[PDB]
Symmetry: C2
Subunit: 221 residues, 2 copies
């Protein structure tokens, strides 16, 4: 597995563009490493095709995507023609992000990207649907662990990406169901002095039974 | 850390409903064990308040929620009075769901819930925004890990529960960004003659440059 303070290992692995070092791939950009169970599968095809459409948005926001499965690069390159066909693009071998060959399930044990009750006909447990979000400083900023049966929300991946990019920029936080542009919460350890000088668009605090002044809203900084 | 197919640690803890045991709480019901940084916090107020409004839409689906902070049951109930006030109801120290006490931090280094950045006034790490979807078999079905800066989408936590429950009933899988009601995907293992009897509503296939027949859609069974 991997915890929120851990560092993405500079692992070496083979992809659809060749072998790479992890950190060297990222360098000074945010990284999204997501894994999918098998290639030539129906939900995975939707998932990786949804990604390929979102790669422009993830790009201009300084994020690099990269895929991973147990299937070979021989397949990855061929499946991309189907993935491209799904998106009604010209069925090339080229995707806007890479896919890692994890033939031997090395970094899938390293990172805990395994599945229960899912394996190949060869009798080997496959990947699951994980998404690791790393920051420019190579640390784990977020992670989700989804089942093989349950597909992922990529509109949710983009949402928390803007947050992580916003909450690190400003001394704010994003509440539940927060949509891009909605009001953010004021970090509760900030006094009304430094606060009003940070958010000139105003800080708005509700009053609650215990008379604490922590519930403070403010428009997007 | 924690992985999929791991039986939920049958712990005992003191809560806002008493000291109870984990499997004894759940019993035979799907369970969502979510955490939160700290009580009296602007984001976690939006969170737990949302979780209390959504509580019936979980129990309708046989899902009992339970929360967890590093705070005292005294601080919970005084905050639970501020929680219900957040959503404009009777400011009682009562919620739809138990909140777990974990000051001694036993369940936080065990479950991999510790947030790297955020800590309490004494220098000790506080919980992160973790969610543990456990099946009725006590085993882990889905997990998400979020920082204290970025707040969870509970509409999505509801999204995955519905799918986890359909996907354990019918032999399908939900694609990317799937909403309740929408068409699902047919499992790759299921051959052509079985896919007709299993799904009498039409099974529609996407023709792909590979030439295989995996990308098959079907109405929600």
């Amino acid at each position: 597995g991997l915890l929120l303070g851990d560092v993405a290992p500079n692992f070496e692995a083979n992809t659809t563009v060749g072998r790479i070092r992890f950190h060297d791939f990222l360098g000074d950009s945010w990284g999204i490493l997501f894994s999918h169970p098998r290639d030539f599968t129906p939900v995975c095809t939707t998932e990786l095709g949804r990604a390929a459409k979102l790669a422009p948005e993830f790009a201009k926001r300084n994020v690099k995507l990269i895929a991973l499965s147990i299937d070979s690069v021989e397949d990855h390159l061929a499946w991309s023609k189907d993935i491209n066909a799904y998106n009604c693009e010209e069925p090339t071998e080229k995707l806007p992000f890479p896919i890692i060959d994890d033939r031997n399930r090395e970094l899938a044990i390293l990172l805990g990207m395994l599945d229960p009750a899912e394996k190949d006909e060869k009798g080997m447990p496959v990947t699951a649907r994980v998404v690791f979000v790393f920051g420019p400083d190579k640390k784990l900023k977020l992670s989700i662990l989804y089942p093989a049966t349950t597909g992922r929300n990529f509109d949710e991946i983009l949402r928390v990406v803007i947050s992580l990019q916003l909450t690190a920029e400003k001394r704010v936080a994003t509440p539940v169901d927060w949509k891009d542009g909605d009001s953010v919460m004021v970090l509760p350890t900030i006094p009304e002095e430094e606060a009003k000088k940070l958010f000139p668009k105003g800080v708005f605090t509700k009053e609650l039974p215990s008379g604490k002044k922590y519930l403070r809203y403010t428009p997007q900084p």
